[PDB]
Amino acid sequence: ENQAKVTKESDSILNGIREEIAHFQKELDDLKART
Amino acid sequence: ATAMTYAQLENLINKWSLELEDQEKHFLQQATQVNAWDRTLMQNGERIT
Amino acid sequence: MAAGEHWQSALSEHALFSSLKERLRDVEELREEGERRASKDKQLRNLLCVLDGDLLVWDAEECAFHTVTLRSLSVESTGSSSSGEQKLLCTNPPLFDVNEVLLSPTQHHVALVGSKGVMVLEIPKRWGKKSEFEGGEKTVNCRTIPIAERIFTSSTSLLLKQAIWYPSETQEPHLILLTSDNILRLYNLQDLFTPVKVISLSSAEEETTLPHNGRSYKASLGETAVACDFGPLAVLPKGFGQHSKEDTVAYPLYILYETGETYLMYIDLQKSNITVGKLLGPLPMYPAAEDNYGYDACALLCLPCVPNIIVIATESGLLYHCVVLEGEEDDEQTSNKSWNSSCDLIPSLYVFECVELELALKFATEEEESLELDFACPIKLHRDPICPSRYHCTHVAGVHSVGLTWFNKLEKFLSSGEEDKDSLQELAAEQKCLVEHILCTKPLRCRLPSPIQGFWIISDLFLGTSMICITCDFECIVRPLLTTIRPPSPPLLCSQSDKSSTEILPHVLADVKGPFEEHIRGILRRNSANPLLLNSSSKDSSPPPEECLQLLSRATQVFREEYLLKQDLANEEIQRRVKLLIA
């Protein structure tokens, strides 16, 4: 389209970052529960 | 979502490193307890023999 | 701990650093535009000192000293001293060259050294009351005295190269200045400009009786000094410095040039050295030499441990670890490098490893058991007071902590032999020395490298182990130093205690795999870690989402292939061994 493509890419990158952070937090919580 | 910045990334890395060091200390304490139990069992077996 | 982190949080949240940053911003706004770029692209410095537990910060924009009480900072996280925060004249514009600061070993004098001379200031001890002078005194002598100004103001061709203190507290602490013409001037704190001691290096490329100031034969050979460091109390050769066959402790002076030629000097005021005017060197190579031991050496650090370990930090980002060994008698190496009539004992430097630091911090393109460099930046080495083997390396690219894991194995092999299969595996595979990139002032190549105004390691019983850093923005960054990110060190003289570790476990009535502590350590061993992305207060550039994603993915991969996958397997071993031990 235009300048909205960069904003959409940044939003997708932020969503992926948040998903990775949530997955890492869930893995850490599971490891702590197992320990 | 939340705008990730250099300070936020540094804080997250520091928190993860602190949690890793705490887990390492807990594992070291567990290993020390296991070694003490192993030494006690070895002494008991050497006495029973 | 709680008390070990409360004082760090208080030092980080105190308003003194915010006021310093505001003053720096006001000065930058009042000045021109090139001064800001010069201050942001200048070299590394260190303007932090410790006096009786109090932290003294040297503000060069106003030529002042700021005193902070780390012991009182732990009270309501903002201090509890109405007169503890001392300011030493915050209204002096800069005149002479201000480069670095040094403290006397007797804790009484502060010397501001710059490429023009030294300025000495008498600061009394801080004890009693609110950590004031002599228990509450603000009328002491607080005036600066110049030192070695005429030598550098009469001839603009030669300047000051290096300056250090004499490690002695039973007498008057002297100041040793190594100039550009390979001249060592030992000055006293009570004299104006009268040289107390003058030493002229002489060998084959230096000068001792050649003409001075103008046409001289020194330029026909070149070879200019770069850095000089002091070593631990060892022994001196019988044919150098003395005439008898007795032993005498002395302070060795290791001089490192630009190429990498390390020279040997014996400077000691406790005994009158006979042959001290002849410069000894260079030290021979063993078993060979790649490029004179260092591509572009600039920093030398001699560890006080036994045997002697020389860390050579180059400008490209290479740390060569040379063990000091005795001179070989099979080949004529000690008599060829000695410039005297007697065969002087010239030790050799055996290079064991060449670590490559992580400079500029590129994208995810390296490995997980080593580090790669990028840009060439000057690196300054500092001896960690927690352990003589462990040390720190500071540069505009960031801060690294290097602990010699192979040093303990080498010492054990030299004493009796190497033991523990877990320690053998740690020494052979995975890694060799534990290198960790802590702070990273330079996020990428596109970002301008910000210089660190000071870096210190506070090690106390009531305060813990902390690393304090003050960058160009006058911002305080304090980090903890746990005993788990360092290799285990047995209680010894050349190796302080860090954590208890037991080895050699018998296997005759149970079913385990060696010592469990050492096995867990070898499983959790690593050699790569993501540094802390420091955020500048002035905000030079916003972090782009692509680079943020790349950095976070690299950090996640590192923590998953070096920490996460190793902790999940450790708990399974414990769960499997619990049932066997119960049976």
Place this chain on the structure above:
Amino acid sequence: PPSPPLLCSQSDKSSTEILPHVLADVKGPFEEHIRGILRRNSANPLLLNSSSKDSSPPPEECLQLLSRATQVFREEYLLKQDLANEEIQRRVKLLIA
């Protein structure tokens, strides 16, 4: 001339007062820094009317000479005087304090 540790009995001191010292033991005023700042290789000649010219002075030549003289002055004395004034002002607020 340039002033290293020399015999100066005009403005430099030796200890507490002005003394003809031969070795630099105590800095006098700021003569060494002044010389280090003035370290140059040019000069500021004072012109005098005493020659027999051929005709009228050209305006272009006069402007060129004036510009050259002003540039030489601003490059050889202005910055040095500014640095000297800054060094003098450096010890004023500290003196009052």
Place this chain on the structure above:
Amino acid sequence: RYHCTHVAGVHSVGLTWFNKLEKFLSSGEEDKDSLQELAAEQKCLVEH
């Protein structure tokens, strides 16, 4: 110190190596270091 006259004008020239000469005279007339310092070379400063 002296003055040099030429068709251009008058210059003032002062000896810069007089300091090294005084250092030689103070250290002694039988010193190899002072002899080398005297044998050294340097430049002066012309003042029109």
